[PDB]
Each structure stands twice: as C-alpha cells, then as structure tokens.
Amino acid sequence: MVLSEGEWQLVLHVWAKVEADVAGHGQDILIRLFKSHPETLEKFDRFKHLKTEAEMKASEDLKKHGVTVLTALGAILKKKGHHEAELKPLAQSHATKHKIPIKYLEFWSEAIIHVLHSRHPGNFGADAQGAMNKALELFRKDIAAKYKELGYQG
C-alpha cells in the first residue's frame, strides 16, 4: 500500500500540532492505552506498579518514555513511507526483547487516533483520520513483515 502526497500532507499537518507539546501528547496516549487495554501495562516492568491514572500522570518516568516513543514515531512518519532503516531496530527490540504482539500494536494505533481526535478536532476530520489510519496501518504491516523475518509470530 502507498499513501498519496495529499494523504501524507494531512498526516504531517496534524503531527505539526502534536509537536507543539510532545510530552503532553505522549502522556495522554500512553495513559489512554493502559486504560483501554490494561493487559498492555503488564509488558512494562518499569510501569507495572502504577495503580491509578493519578499515579500515571505524576510519573516522570512515564512522561519520559512518552517523549521517546512519539519522537521515534515522528521520525518514521516524516520519512513518508521510506522508513526501512528506522523500522529495523524497532522491530527487533519489540519482537525479541520486549515481545510485543501485533495485536498490541493495533491497540496502540487506536490510542493515538483517540487522543488526536480529542485534542485536534479541527485538524482531524474524517479525511485526516483516514489518512492517519492508513499511515499507521502501513507501519503495522511493515513491522509485521519484519517480525516474521526475525522469527516472531506477532
């Protein structure tokens, strides 16, 4: 699958807004993920102890990870499809070290879409959400292909 330039423009336009507050968006997205699919939290030995949303919001450690995650995702999105080099190490660490099922990657995509829709309604209408979903599906498809090559189900 390939996104059109018009689709990439919609994706990068809303991403530019996300970049005005990377730490805040990182926090919102991770918390959304954990609240919607609590089982994902078990994969983070570093955050498994957090019991409430209040504790998550206060964790400087969780905020730091959110920044790291969004910065990596941003670098990938800006490649507009030419992300093979950036994807390799990420696929390897998540398949071999962290052991993240492809199913959890879908939950992740859901969380990002929910937060963008909540914080940027004006720049995240139907067309823009469709473009973002397509970009995230592209990423998931490529990561899934790499998982297989690396010897991990998904």
Q: Which residues bind ligand HEM (CB under 6 A)?
A: 40, 43-44, 46, 68-69, 72-73, 90, 93-94, 98, 100, 104-105, 108
Give me the half-sphere count of Cα atoms (radius 13 Å) on the Cβ side of residue 62: 25
Tell me the residue nearest to ligand HEM as measured from the CB. 93
Minimum CB distance to ligand HEM, residue 76 (Å): 7
Min dist CB 42 to ligand HEM, Å, is 9
- Pick between residue 46 and residue 57 the one whose CB is nearest to ligand HEM: 46
Q: How far is the CB of 57 from ligand HEM (least distance, A)?
A: 18
The response to whether 65 counts as a known ligand-binding position is: yes
Query: What residues have CB less than 8 Å from 102, skipping those under 6 apart?
Result: 140, 143, 144, 147, 154
DSSP string, the chain: ----HHHHHHHHHHHHHHGGGHHHHHHHHHHHHHHH-GGGGGG-TTTTT--SHHHHHH-HHHHHHHHHHHHHHHHHHTTTT--HHHHHHHHHIIIIIS---HHHHHHHHHHHHHHHHHH-GGG--HHHHHHHHHHHHHHHHHHHHHHHHHT---
Looking at beta carbons only, is 115 or 122 nearer to ligand HEM? Answer: 115
49 is in an annotated binding site: no
Of 93 and 153, nearer to ligand HEM (C-beta) is 93
Q: How far is the CB of 121 from ligand HEM (least distance, A)?
A: 23
Quote the tokens at residue 139: 């990423």
Which one, 10 or 29, has the nearer CB to ligand HEM?
29
Q: Residues marked as binding for O2? A: 65
Q: Residues marked as binding? A: 65, 94
Q: Residues marked as binding for nitrite? A: 65
